[PDB]
């Protein structure tokens, strides 16, 4: 089955290809990327595109205390036929502003590296808290 | 990578073990299973549990015009540690009404069948419409 990406004890645990991306997000998020055990996770941001690789790097690029990305999934076919697959990644955040910043984070990364694909993203709000909290 | 669930042009295509659940939702949702162009898909429902099995059936149980479930995926690890895996499936809908009816469609099945466990669920809202409609 599908397994979520591993947590990082040290920054060297991050896959080499996504290492420049994980660092940038870190510095950018800063204390916002830190976990705030007050906050319940009702929010996320869904990145989707045609390229599964750039989304894979993004999945392993955001891994933090307050910002966590799920593995690489896909959206079901729009019509009766099989459309070209649109892969998607859910990055779960702790609030409305954090998710906005995670959206800005990837947008900033895309401005730094035009060779990286320019993705699509939408803010997500869950009505119920997701069990991303550590006991 | 992961693959989106293959659409069904007919009832038989649903996996043998998951057949009764699919037919249940088809009658239960009814007119709500219709595909309405007027409403873009801003909504969804995420079911989650430890059992990847019950999520598989559900993922292939909801496939309709106005109801599309994605592939079986998972939530990120709660802490820096490694935790027992919590799987999840996003059932996408074009409105708050259909999605809220999808949620109780599962509960109606759960109360009917003691074998299928009780899955925690949350209503999902996206601000930007997802590309779930014909080109």
CA B45 to chain centre: 7
Interface touch A92/B74, C-beta < 8 Å:
no
Q: How many residues does chain A have?
A: 135
Provide Rg for chain B, Cα atoms.
15
Report in angstroms the alpha-carbon separations of A111 from A17, A34, A100, A114.
Answer: 18, 24, 17, 6
Domain spans in chain B, listed from the N-terminal domain onward: 1-135
CA distance B43 to chain A (A): 9
CA distance B10 to chain A (A): 11
Nearest CB neighbour to B73, from listed A71, A120, A131: A71
Interface touch A4/B122, C-beta < 8 Å:
no
CA distance A44 to chain B (A): 9
DSSP chain A: ---PPPP-SSGGGS-GGGHHHHHHHHHHHGGGSS--TT----EEEEEEES-HHHHHHHHHH-BSSS-EEEEEEEEPPSSSS-PPPEEEEEEEESSHHHHHHHHHHHHHHHHH-TTS---EEEEEEESS--S----
DSSP A49-83: ES-HHHHHHHHHH-BSSS-EEEEEEEEPPSSSS-P
Which is it for the CA torsion A119, A36, A73, A52, positive or negative? positive
Interface touch B126/A46, C-beta < 8 Å:
yes
> Which of A73, A86, A119, A128 is the best mutation test for B, with the most CBs of B within 10 A?
A73
In the numeric block, which tokens belong to residue B73?
A: 């995926």
Name the structure determination technique. Answer: X-ray
Which is it for the CA torsion B86, B92, B96, B102, positive or negative? negative
Long-range CB contacts for residues A38-42, cutoff 8 Å, separation at least 24: A39/A66, A39/A94, A39/A95, A40/A94, A40/A129, A40/A133, A41/A92, A41/A93, A41/A94, A41/A126, A41/A129, A41/A130, A41/A132, A41/A133, A42/A95, A42/A125, A42/A126, A42/A127, A42/A128, A42/A129, A42/A130
Residues contacting residue A111 through CB under 8 Å, at least 6 positions apart: none
Interface touch B7/A85, C-beta < 8 Å:
no
The secondary structure of B20-60, three-state, reads: HHHHHHHHHHHHHHCCCCCCCCCEEEEEEECCHHHHHHHHH
Nearest CB neighbour to B72, from listed A2, A69, A121: A2
Instruction: Give the residue from A130, A62, A70 showing the smallest Cα distance to A101.
Output: A62
B1-135 homologous superfamily:
Epstein Barr virus nuclear antigen-1, DNA-binding domain (3.30.70.390)
Q: Which residues pair with B126 in a beta bridge?
A: A124
What's this structure's resolution in Å?
3.2
- Count of Cβ atoms closer than 10 Å to residue A1 Cβ: 11
Nearest CB neighbour to A127, from listed B73, B74, B123: B123
CA B19 to chain centre: 14
Q: Which residues pair with B63 in a beta bridge?
A: B68
Provide the greatest CA pair distance for chain A: 46
| Cβ-Cβ contacts under 8 Å, A120 against chain B | 128
Asked if residues B46 and B89 have their Cβ atoms less than 8 Å apart, the reply is yes
> Burial, B1: exposed, middle or buried (Cβ in 10 Å; 0-12, 13-18, 19+)?
middle
> Burial, A61: exposed, middle or buried (Cβ in 10 Å; 0-12, 13-18, 19+)?
buried
């Amino acid at each position: 089955y599908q397994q979520p990406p591993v947590p990082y004890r040290q920054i060297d645990d991050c896959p080499a290809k996504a290492r420049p991306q994980h660092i940038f997000y870190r510095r950018f998020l800063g204390k916002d990327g830190r976990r705030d055990p007050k906050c319940q996770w009702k929010f996320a941001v869904i990145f989707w595109g045609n390229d599964p690789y750039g989304l894979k790097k993004l999945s392993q690029a955001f891994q933090f205390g307050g910002v966590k990305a799920g593995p690489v999934s896909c959206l079901p076919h729009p019509g009766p036929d099989q459309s070209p697959i649109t892969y998607c990644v859910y990055v779960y955040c702790q609030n409305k502003d954090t998710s906005k910043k995670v959206q800005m984070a990837r947008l900033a990364w895309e401005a730094s590296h035009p060779l990286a694909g320019n993705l699509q993203s939408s803010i997500v709000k869950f009505k119920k808290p997701l069990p991303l909290t550590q006991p």
